[PDB]
Design a protein around this nucleic acid. Structure first.
Ligand SMILES: Nc1ncnc2c1ncn2[C@@H]1O[C@H](COP(=O)(O)OP(=O)(O)OP(=O)(O)O)[C@@H](O)[C@H]1O
Ligand SMILES: [Ca+2]
Ligand SMILES: [Ca+2]
Ligand SMILES: [Ca+2]
Ligand SMILES: [Ca+2]
Ligand SMILES: [Ca+2]
Ligand SMILES: [Ca+2]
Length: 903
DNA sequence: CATGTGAGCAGTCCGCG
DNA sequence: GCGGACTGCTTAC
């Protein structure tokens, strides 16, 4: 097989690499890497090395990496550019793997672990590690086994061995319900003392050394705790055995009272699943406990236990160990669905970087561009220092706040990357500048044509048309990958709706789910078979289609983020190719594009409808337009339509057959105007929206910029079995909004858009009558707890103290000297509840760690002093007032002359 | 060590016979 | 109480 790296590190003048050899065996080696960098030399000196602007360079080969670094300093002092890849391990990988890496994940040791630590005096701080580690579960991907290390004797209690028989039993039968599919994969190892446990753990570690290390919060808890605990018991050099090169660095975050730390294990790639999830999932959650996220992703119940976690081991060691095991499995279950490890490995090896550098789009693109240029013997520019400078972005149209009955939306496919490719924006394709007219003059086609030779953006930049740029070249590769996966995602989504439609009439049979590939639209013959399947088989198929769609979502959305990241990186001062000329060339062109196409669409629709000067485009944001379709529907007349799907079909066809071509003509004309390299502005229809035919639903409304809701029947070619709400910016979409208020507000919207005013009014009345019966957690607001210390003045709020921070301080005083009430962690999320006047907490609100029940000693008082009136007003009524005034609708029946009668 | 800008809302402070 | 000014948080692109 072809060889590939696992990890790489620079340690002094040595590169330390772990890799897989030609026989599929894991190997390690230390290489005294001799790097090269480059300097500009005279034209009269012949050479095969040129910088990206075609200037000749000479290669300086160094005896070691220190010499290379030292030379960079001297060049800095002299005043001359030192070119080439200055991160030497990227150069090493590039030299060592001079081909497209094709890796085999079954050879890559992926470890998932978590530890338990009983602590009777508050949270067990990793920096101090003053308590025994009393459980570790460590799953190994190569063995496919859960290695369980169990401490039976501790100064906090001696317990009996864990029972696998009992673990496997249902909870309703006193067991722990450890999933049957992992029971046979558990290797249980009990220990009579911690020193033996830890030593065996370390020996195990040496035999099965993680390449990818993950788990939930392993970076800020598990890893530093294990490191510091081992350090305290055996000494630091023993702790260093967790690194295969015996090297670690300790990062100490001292904030202000007290301190925590991150540990870097050289030769391991740590990908904390919490960080993967945040970066790659595109959710914002009110809590990031594993219980919350597991329920969210997997619909599995919370791991239930009686009493505090500090007492769980002594009172119920059996459950304690089972839950340690299950927690580890849950991360594997989430990854099976989301496939973030796979994504990370894909992106890592594609770029030729340390796998953990997938968290940095700058490192990732720097590597991709370096490798690309190196293949043509080109030499990369030196990184430079730049002051941070704000610069202009997108254009957003101010919408008239209103209800909007029929709406069709369109937006550009991969807008910024497509602009890069169309214009040919790269560091080395800059041809010069031209004198800019006001943007409005370009939008209206009255400015002088910028150039009849070069490819232009209305920011004033010109680019070569007749040569490729590395930025366009490399961004197109990732875009094309993105597009493939998105095709699979949408097919799977369309396939899902076919199955949902068939679930309306399930057959009374015993059959199996069809063996099909969900990434491709079902053939007619598969669709016929589906119409004969049972409910059980159809639901299994619907599950598989949805898992296929999720996998496609992961792959497409993060490749999308990566290419958009390149456009953004051009405006980050730490990016080697930082250049506001290129960053603003993209954004300014975007602004022109949106406003140009708005004009063209208004022109076209006035023409086909026989009118003049009516505004069909009601909103737009960056690269999208929202077209009121009312006059289109009225042109034919609503009476002509047989059902909702008939008008949806009609608008879909109108968009595809009449609008999109007119849009394409408009953008081709714009491409000619700007003399661009290639026409890539593809503005495809997104949503078709309206009320159900014959209903009093209003279809949609806007309250303002970035705030709207649409009743959608077809989305990018997916015709829904049941209409779906597209809501942007409104409180339903905000993680700060209480969970039950999100629900209620969404149902208020659903009723507005699908049913009308009377339906709304009925629901609003019920919700107000029952609000006070909702669970306190379901109606608590959420906020991130940043800069808590700044406003902490003897446990009381300093000046400008934010509401949520004030609540935290209130909580701190109420739990003061409580030996095990959860502490609010800086930067994490909290629930927030307002408090009525005269409460015993002595302030207007309280805040506690999100995803948790508030500690029992103050829970009773919080429940008693909760200000429901304020809570209802702020979180529910005030937003709904915004929705309904915007829609010209009332959520309570207005008083009128009719109130004189008895109806 | 390091993707970007645009924009609304909820909060505090401050003014207000 | 209720605006305007300022800013933090969260989010749509
Ligand atoms: N996370 C982001 N970082 C940087 N720029 C972004 C980001 N999200 C959106 N943009 C910019 O706004 C543009 C339009 O956003 P949009 O969400 O429509 O994505 P897109 O790239 O056009 O892909 P799609 O084909 O899915 O519409 C992007 O092309 C760019
Ligand atoms: Ca635990
Ligand atoms: Ca788009
Ligand atoms: Ca059927
Ligand atoms: Ca868009
Ligand atoms: Ca699209
Ligand atoms: Ca109490």
């Amino acid at each position: 097989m072809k060889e590939f790296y696992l990890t790489v590190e620079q340690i002094g003048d040595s590169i330390f690499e772990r890799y897989i050899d030609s026989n599929g065996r894991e190997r390690t080696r230390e290489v005294e890497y001799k790097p090269s960098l480059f300097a500009h030399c005279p034209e009269s000196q012949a050479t095969k090395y040129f910088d990206i602007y075609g200037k000749p360079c000479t290669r300086k080969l160094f005896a070691n990496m220190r010499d290379a670094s030292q030379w960079i300093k001297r060049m800095e002092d002299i005043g001359l550019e030192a070119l080439g890849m200055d991160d030497f391990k990227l150069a090493y990988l590039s030299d060592t793997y001079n081909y497209e890496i094709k890796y085999d994940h079954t050879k890559i040791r992926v470890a998932n672990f978590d530890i338990e630590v009983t602590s009777p005096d508050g949270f067990p701080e990793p920096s101090q590690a003053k308590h025994p580690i009393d459980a570790i579960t460590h799953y190994d991907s190569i063995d496919d086994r859960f290695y369980v290390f169990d401490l039976l004797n501790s100064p906090y209690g001696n317990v009996e061995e864990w029972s696998i028989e009992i673990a496997a039993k249902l909870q309703e039968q006193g067991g722990d319900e450890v999933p049957s599919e992992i029971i046979d994969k558990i290797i249980y190892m009990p220990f009579d003392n911690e020193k033996e446990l830890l030593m065996e753990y370390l020996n195990f570690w040496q035999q099965k050394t993680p390449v990818i290390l993950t788990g939930w919060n392993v970076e800020s808890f598990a890893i530093p705790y294990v490191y510091n605990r081992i350090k305290n018991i055996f000494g630091e050099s023993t702790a260093k055995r967790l690194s295969p090169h015996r090297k670690t660095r300790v990062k100490v975050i001292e904030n202000m009272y007290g301190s925590r730390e991150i540990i870097t294990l050289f030769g391991i790639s740590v990908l904390d699943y919490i960080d993967l999830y945040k970066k790659f999932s595109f959710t914002n959650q009110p809590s990031y406990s594993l219980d919350y996220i597991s329920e969210f992703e997997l619909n599995v119940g919370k791991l239930k236990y009686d009493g505090p976690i500090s007492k769980l081991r002594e009172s119920n060691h059996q459950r304690y160990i089972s839950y340690n095991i299950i927690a580890v499995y849950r991360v594997l279950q989430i990854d099976a669905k989301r496939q973030f490890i796979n994504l990370s490995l894909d992106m890592g090896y594609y770029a030729k970087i340390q796998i953990q550098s997938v968290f940095s789009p700058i490192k990732t693109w720097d590597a991709i561009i370096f490798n690309s240029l190196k293949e043509q013997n080109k030499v990369i520019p030196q990184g430079r220092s730049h002051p941070v400078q704000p610069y202009p972005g997108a254009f957003v149209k101010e919408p008239i706040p209103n209800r909007y009955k029929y709406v069709m939306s369109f937006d550009l496919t991969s807008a910024y990357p497509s602009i890069i490719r169309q214009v040919n924006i790269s560091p080395e394709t800059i041809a010069g500048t031209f004198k800019v007219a006001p943007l409005h003059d370009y939008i209206n086609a009255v400015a002088e044509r910028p150039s009849d030779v070069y490819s232009c953006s209305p920011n004033g930049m010109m680019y070569y048309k007749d040569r490729d740029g590395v930025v366009p070249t490399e961004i197109t590769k990732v875009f094309n990958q993105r597009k493939e996966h998105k095709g699979y995602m949408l097919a799977a989504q369309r396939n899902g709706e076919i199955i949902k439609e068939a679930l309306h009439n399930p057959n009374l049979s015993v059959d199996e789910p069809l063996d099909v590939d969900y990434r491709f639209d079902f053939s007619d013959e598969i669709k016929e078979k589906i119409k004969k399947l049972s409910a059980k088989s159809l639901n299994e198929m619907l599950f598989r289609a949805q898992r296929t769609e999720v996998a496609g979502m992961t792959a497409q959305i993060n490749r999308k983020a990566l290419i958009n990241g390149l456009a953004g990186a051009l405006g980050n001062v730490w990016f080697r190719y930082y250049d506001l000329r290129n960053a603003t060339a993209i954004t300014t062109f975007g602004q022109m594009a949106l406003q140009w196409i708005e004009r063209k669409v208004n022109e076209y629709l006035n023409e086909v409808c026989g009118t003049e000067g009516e505004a069909f485009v009601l909103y737009g944001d960056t690269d999208s337009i929202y077209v009121s379709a009312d006059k289109i529907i009225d042109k034919v007349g609503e009476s002509k339509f047989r059902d909702t799907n008939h008008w949806v079909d009609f608008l879909d066809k109108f968009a595809r057959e009449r609008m999109e071509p007119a849009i394409d003509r408009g953008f081709r004309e714009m491409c000619e105007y700007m003399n661009n390299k290639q026409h890539l502005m593809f503005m495809d229809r997104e949503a078709i929206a309206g009320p159900p035919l014959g209903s009093k639903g209003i279809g949609g409304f806007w309250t303002g910029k970035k705030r709207y809701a649409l009743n959608v029947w077809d989305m990018e070619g997916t015709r829904y079995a049941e209409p779906k709400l597209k809501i942007m910016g409104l409180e339903t979409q905000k993680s700060s909004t209480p969970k039950a208020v999100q629900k209620a507000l969404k149902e208020c919207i659903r009723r507005m858009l699908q049913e009308g005013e009377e339906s709304l009014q009925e629901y609003f009345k019920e919700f107000e009558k029952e609000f006070r019966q909702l669970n306190y957690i379901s109606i608590a607001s959420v906020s991130s707890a940043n800069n808590i210390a700044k406003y902490d003045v003897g446990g009381f709020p300093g000046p400008k103290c934010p509401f949520h921070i004030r609540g935290i301080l209130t909580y701190n005083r109420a739990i003061k000297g409580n030996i095990d009430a959860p502490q609010v962690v800086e930067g994490e999320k909290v629930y927030v509840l307002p408090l009525r006047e005269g409460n015993p907490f002595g302030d207007k609100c309280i805040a506690w760690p999100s995803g948790t029940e508030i500690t029992d000693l103050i829970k009773d008082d919080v429940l008693h002093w909760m200000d429901y009136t304020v809570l209802l007003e702020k979180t529910f009524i005030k937003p709904l007032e915004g929705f309904t005034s915007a829609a010209k609708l009332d959520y309570e029946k207005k008083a009128s002359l009719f109130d004189m009668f008895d109806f």
